[PDB]
Structure formats: structure tokens, C-alpha cells
Design a protein around this nucleic acid. Sequence first.
DNA 1: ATCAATATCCACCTGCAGATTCTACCAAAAGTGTATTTGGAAACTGCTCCATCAAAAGGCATGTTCAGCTGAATTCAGCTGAACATGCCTTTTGATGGAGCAGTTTCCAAATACACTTTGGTAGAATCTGCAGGTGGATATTGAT
DNA 2: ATCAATATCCACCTGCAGATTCTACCAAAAGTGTATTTGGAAACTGCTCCATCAAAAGGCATGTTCAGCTGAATTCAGCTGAACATGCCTTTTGATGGAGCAGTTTCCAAATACACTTTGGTAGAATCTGCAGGTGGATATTGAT
Lengths: 84, 78, 93, 92, 108, 104, 97, 99
Amino acid sequence: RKVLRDNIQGITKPAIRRLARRGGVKRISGLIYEETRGVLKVFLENVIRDAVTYTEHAKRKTVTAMDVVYALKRQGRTLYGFGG
Amino acid sequence: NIQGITKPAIRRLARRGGVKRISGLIYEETRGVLKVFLENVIRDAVTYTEHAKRKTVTAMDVVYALKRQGRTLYGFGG
Amino acid sequence: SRKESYSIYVYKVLKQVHPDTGISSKAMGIMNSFVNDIFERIAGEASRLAHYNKRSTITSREIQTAVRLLLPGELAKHAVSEGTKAVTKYTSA
Amino acid sequence: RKESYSIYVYKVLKQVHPDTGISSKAMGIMNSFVNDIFERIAGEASRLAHYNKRSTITSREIQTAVRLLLPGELAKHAVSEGTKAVTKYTSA
Amino acid sequence: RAKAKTRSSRAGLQFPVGRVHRLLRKGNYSERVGAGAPVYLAAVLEYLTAEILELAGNAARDNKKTRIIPRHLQLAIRNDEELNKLLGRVTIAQGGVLPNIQAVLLPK
Amino acid sequence: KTRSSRAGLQFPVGRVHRLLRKGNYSERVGAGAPVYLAAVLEYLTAEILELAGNAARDNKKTRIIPRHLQLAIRNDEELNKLLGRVTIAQGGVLPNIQAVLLPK
Amino acid sequence: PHRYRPGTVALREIRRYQKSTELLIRKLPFQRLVREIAQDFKTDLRFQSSAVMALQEACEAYLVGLFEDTNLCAIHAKRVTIMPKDIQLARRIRGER
Amino acid sequence: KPHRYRPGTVALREIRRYQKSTELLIRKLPFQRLVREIAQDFKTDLRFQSSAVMALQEACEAYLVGLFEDTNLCAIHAKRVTIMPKDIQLARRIRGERA
DNA sequence: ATCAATATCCACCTGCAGATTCTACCAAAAGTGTATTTGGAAACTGCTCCATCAAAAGGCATGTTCAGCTGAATTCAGCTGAACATGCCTTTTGATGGAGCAGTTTCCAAATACACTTTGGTAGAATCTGCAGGTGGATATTGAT
DNA sequence: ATCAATATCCACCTGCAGATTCTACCAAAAGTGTATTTGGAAACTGCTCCATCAAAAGGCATGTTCAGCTGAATTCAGCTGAACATGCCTTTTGATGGAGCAGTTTCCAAATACACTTTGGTAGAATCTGCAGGTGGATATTGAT
């Protein structure tokens, strides 16, 4: 494949301010887009960590949606709408 | 009885929290939070007594109700 | 394959409360997870109760205490009522 | 007739700190710790068993539970001790 | 040989009582399961399903639509006090948020 | 002779194995599971006990009280993480005054 | 006569009560409050002495942790005094409200 | 003339707009590759059910929106209208994300 | 920053009481040994479903300019909550005794668990049909004179 | 208080992606007939738990004095919002290769199930660490040249 590199910058600044609108935010400081990216990565890390850990214990090589859900449950962010 | 929790007792609790001074409106708000907490925990604990067909709330019941609410407590059995 | 869900029974209850209203597939998924989430919270809480009280069997009594513990206020008593109702209706005949 | 872990906490205490004792309140803090962890590890393993439609909990289930439950270096260090204890047990 | 009655009918239930019974045994919640537990449970779940469904199909009609989409579900659970409380640590896929602008943020 | 000795552990492998069968966790319990698990609890006990003893002698005391355990868990980063939603009875808090709150 | 400048004894009290682990609420006014709340839920009850101890332990550990988070909100608003505005922001973030 | 909107008017519009919808605000390709990197640089050579990346993005945006809400409440608490990093670390500190 | 005058810690001992530790026996488990079941690991393998690609479009990201006001910095005063001596009362504690009550056996009737012998449920076609997405006038809403 | 600019709300359409319904198979309840528990139902202890009762001791309530914190008011540099041009790269769609999930058998390795033949709990003796004071010397704090 192609080398995967610096893809947290794919989380654009307009995409972040959109997420900020829907959260009820009117004025966004200039430093927010970096902090946002930092926190989202720590988040995604921790979930994909556990999701994959379920993939590994299953001896599976594809990460199933159920793996994501069991992961989100563990962290506490129980999700409705995928694989029951 | 809620006033039995004296203002200086509340004041010390804030002190251990690292609080320097206390607005006079706090002590009422503190007693309201204190009560809702005791309310939610004692209800869940009492429910655990009633399910056991008992009339004495054991320390365990409280431990279970604390865990119940995600305030797990070490030191009182289980 | 053979993957069972509650889509049959959610849809029955949907036609009951809203006889003219349909439901999308995504929304049915949200429901099937909801039935499953509650089912686990209650059963787990009763599993814990029976274990706390040194009893190897889960009666409908344990489930009721679980329902009181998990469900908030009026949702609890409205539920407990509906349950007890279906139990007495069952045992009677 | 109530059993506890206080016998084994004391053996492990005298092991690491032969010079040090422990108070009774602190001994209950420890038992409760043991019990809490025990539930976390076992439940997470039980849920692993069910998610994958297996009916037996092996040491493997307990390991994945530890990686999910124990943060960072506690994980690797704890995974080691079990694999150590399983290996030493199985040998003879 | 007598005719078979579904347990869900006998309790006057839409939800599957026989299935809830199996899922209590094969779920390892206790070694043995009482016969009133699957009934009592299937009733409670059916009740809560009915509650959520009524408030959603209401909000579906409020938005002038006859088919419940997850947006309506999120509107229903979040606008009701106890439902939101029961589903606090819970996110609905494609759910959105309740419109809520702060007072301070509004124009002069 | 004991299963715990075969594993070379201080924690009861036999008792843990019964606790897994009586615990309603799985239909059957493997033979390697309770060994593995008992070793993990033994270790985690040791690591808390060591840090508690250090906190105990750092306070001139030879008997570990709960305060030494709270200091041991809250000053350790990864134990504080594992036991975040946990209250140590009679534990107190670590001394910490905010900078802004300090005298001139 | 001699007096300590205001706020001095406050930091002194902070450094003492953070140093100790004693229970800070008087035992009986608490226990009286506990049984009162239990009465409102069930009548003629009885508590193990260790059960009122548990509730008092859990309860001061809750409040002290809240005051920690409350103080941080007071600091976040360029203030030094904790107000009911701070306790409400603290609990509305935690999810208790 | 030409017309201009008083700064602050478009955001109130934008808040009302995205609070009324349920679409996913992050573009899907950059989020997908971001997930594959975080996963690749965790366990090499993996695959992903499309619905698994969906579920990730759903839970992610849901998380961040709820973080902004809690953040904005801290900004309002500081008599500001602009959300700053200072607010987010506070919100996550109280949340227990990292106290 | 020093020179003093309180009030505060903090070091160093010390004898004792309340717990801690070590001791003596006792059922309740735990470990063996033997004999069955049985769960899931290995070995194909059919086949969803994932990874990759190309090609065109048009949605949207990016970067730049401009400036309205928002955050921050400053000043000050009123007034709130800290400090403090003080005067009394509610808590502490230390049994002491009385009994309601959690805890233990010993039956057993009733409720469950198994172990095999008729649909409800699900996976697909085969029909239906909300509403997504595109337009345009009605209606606000906003901001400049 | 007007009057364009511009955005929003909302009714109308209509083919279509997606729901709803129809239909054959089949996994899983249901129904019966025994084989086990199991948790009450009484019958009785020993705990613990409530209840006064009665001193004293801090501990709390209180009122006065004012130090300095908060909140309001003002000012302004400059940040971040609003618009617009620009062109990239996401999106959309449709097709394939084949990996690796997942449905089936087959069959040992391993877990289970009784049957019999030490450890851990528990309630006493024999220590024993910390408590809780008590001077006594820097320490930190605050008032005044």
C-alpha cells in the first residue's frame, strides 16, 4: 500500500468548527483546532486499542463493528445502532 | 437534621479540598448536594436490605449501593 | 447465518402505540440495541442480587428489585406494575 | 465462617517488606482491592467468552482481560506473572 | 396431545418470553432460572420499548413524517426527563443534539 | 500438595478456581485460568504493598495504615488510573494547594 | 493585640486537614441525618455501626472531591472564592446534573 | 454596497443549522485513513468492516460535540464567549478524563 | 529586608493501652484418583465483503483581506466573608441491659432441570411508497441610511 | 423608522432507494414425564443494636472589626469572524481479485463428576507499635523605623 502519515491533519479546521457549532459554541479561539486534534487522537487511540484487542482475542484479522461496540461500552460510551 | 451538619464542618471539608475562602451561599448548596447524595445511596442500599428480607441495613448493603452508583469503596468488606 | 433480533416485537409494539407510523432500518437498530442494553443491565443486576443473597436461582423477584434499582422514578413503578401484571396473568392461566 | 485474603496479603507483605506490618483497616482496604480486581478481571473475561461464543474461560481469556483492564506497564508486568505461573504450574 | 400456547400470549405479551428465558440461561447470570423471571423481564422490556416508541412517533408526527428515523429517537429520549436519565452514558447513531443555544450567546 | 505451590504463588489457586465456578462467569472454567488469575492478584497486591511500605517508612512508621495506601496509589500514576473511581476509606487526599491560591 | 492577616489561617487549615484523614463531620448529627433519610424510605430500621461509618466515609470523600473540582472552577473564572455557580458547573460537567 | 453580516450572526446561524441536522461533520475519507493509521501503528496489517469505521466516527463526533458543550459552559463561566484550550483541559479534568 | 513579639510548628523522648501478632485446635475445603462427557482446535472450503482502482465533478477546504468587538489589562470601592475572643450546649463516651433479629439446622412441598417428540421467525424475493432532493414564491431577518 | 439583501421557512412534485409484505424452510419453543434441588416454614439461639443515663470537653454559634476580593466601568490592541476567490481532493459509482469469515465435519485434549483421605478460620494468650503529651528551639508571620 501507501505509507500512512500525518492523517490527524485530515481533521480539518472547518470540520472542527462544525463540531463546535453543534455543541453550542459561538466563538472559537485560534488554538482550539490543535487541542481538539490532540484530544480526538487520544480518544481514537484508546478505543481502537481496545477494539483491536478484541480482534486479537477473537483470532480475527478484520476489526468487526462489534469489536468497536464492545470497546466503546468498556470505555463507557455505549453506542446504539451497530450490530445490536 | 440537615442543619446538624454544621457550617464549620462543611468549612473543613472544603479546606481538605484545597479551598481558600467560602461564599456564604455555599453552606446551603453544600447541604443540598450532601442530601441528594445520601438520598440516592441510602435508597439503593435500603433496596438491598428489603430484597434480603432484613430490617438491619448492613455495611455491605451500603458498599453495594456505593458500587451501584460508581462510588466503589474499599475497606468495609468487599 | 440465522441472526435473530427483536425487530418482530418492536414492530408489533410500534403498530400498537402508533398504528399509522413506520420505522426505518437504522432506527430499528437503535431499538434492538436498546432492548439488548436494558436486558443486560437488568439480568446482570439480578445476577448480582441472587449472588449477594447466596441463592443459586433468579426468581422474578430478583428482576423486580433490579427494575427498581435501574429504572428512575415513575418509569420504575410503571414498569414494576406492568411486570407483576404479566406474571400474575401467567401463573393464574 | 467468613473467609478473606488476609492470610495471603500478609505472606506477600512479609515477602516484599519483611520489616513492615499492617493495620487492620489497611487489611480490609486490601481485601476489598483483591475482590474488586477479581470481579473486573473475571467479568471482562466472561464477556470475552460470550462475545466469541465460547463456554469455557481459559487463562487466555484472563490475559486479554488484563490487557483491557490494566493500564500501561501494569499490564505487561501482570501478563508476565500469570504466564510465569501458568508455565511453572504446567511443567510439573 | 394438547395445543401449544406461546408463553408470551399466556402473559399477554408481544415480546418473546421463551426467548428471554433462553437468553437468561445461556447468559450465565445464575445456575438456574425461575419461571416467572423471563415473563416479568419480557414485560418490562416491552413496556420500555412501548414508552420510547410512543414519544418518538409523537416527535415523528411533529416533524411531519410517518416513519421513525433515529433523529426522532434521540429527540424523544433526550426531551423526556427519566428516559434521558436512564440513557445518560448512551449515544444514538445519527442522533444529533437537542437544539440549545445559551442565553448569554444570543444577540444584544 | 497444593496447586498454589505448584504455581509458586502465595495466593490460593484452589480458592480462586472455586470462586470462578461459583461466580456465574462461565459454564466451565479451564485449569490454567485460576492459576494465571491468582498470580495477577498476588502481583498487584505486592506492587501496592511495596509502595505502601515505602510510604510507611517514609513516614517513620513500621505498620501500614490506609493513609499509606492512599499516598501509595495516588502518587503512583498507573495505580491512580486503575483505581480512579475508587475511594480508600480513611485515605485522605494528597496535599495540593493551587499556585494561584498561595501568598504573595 | 496580634492578629493573622486574612487568608493566612485558611491556608493553614488547608495544610492541616490535607495532612490528616480524620472524619470532619460530627458523628451524631450525621448519623441522625442518615436515619432520618432512611425513615423517609422505610420505617423501624437499624444500621450496623459500620454502616453509618461507611456512609460517612463515602460522603466526605464525595464532598472533598467535589470541592476540589469546585475550586478549579473558581480559579477558571479568575476568582478565589467558591460560589454556588462553581458547584453547579462542577456537577453539570461530571454528569450529576 | 455590498452586504455584510455583523460578526457573530453567521455562527448563531451555524449553531441552529448543525443542531437541526444529524449528518457526520468530519469528511469520511480523512477520518477513515486516520483510523487506519492509529490502528496500523498499533497492530500491523488489519482490515475494517465499513460499519466499524462508521461506528468509530459516530462515537467520535458524538464525543467531541459533548466535549464542546461542556467546554462552552466553562467559557461562559469565565465571562467569555470564546472557547479556549484552557476551558477544554478544565472540562476534561472534571470529567475525569485526566484529573 | 531586618528588628521584635507573638503564636506556630516541629524534634526528641517516653510509658501504656489498644490493637497486633503469634498459638492451639477444629470443620470445610482442596487435592487425588478414577471414569465420563464434551468443548473447541484442526482441517478444508464456500463465499461475503473488503481493499483497490479509475474517472469525472463539484463540494468544500484553504488562504487572504479587513475590521468589529471581544478578551485582557487597569482602576477602585463597596461590601462580603476572614479572624477572634467569647459564652454556652451539643457531642463524646462509657458502659449496661433488654430484646429484636440476623443466622443455623431439619425437614420437605413446590419449583426447576433435563431429555425428546410443532410452529414462530428469519432469510430471502416480490411488491409497495415515504420522502430525499430540487424549485420557487412567501416570509422573515438583518443591517445600512 | 424605512428599505433593500439575503437567508429561511415551507408547500408542491415524483422517481427511487428503501421499507413493507408475501413465502418456504427450520431452529427453537412447547408439552409431558420423571430426577433433583432449593429455599422457605418453623424452631432457637448469641450477636449486635437500640436505649437511656450521666458527666465534661471541646466544639459551635455569635457578634464585632476590617482586609482585600469581587464586580463593575473603562479602554484598546489585535484576534478571530465574515467574505470571496481558487482549485484541490473528497465523493460517487461501478467492477474485480481474493483474502479470511464463517459454516461444517471429525476427534483428541481437556474439563467435569463423584469418592475419599490438609488448610484456613476462629477465638484465645504474649507482645508491642503509636498515641498523645511536654518542653524546648528554630519557623513563619506580621507590625513598626
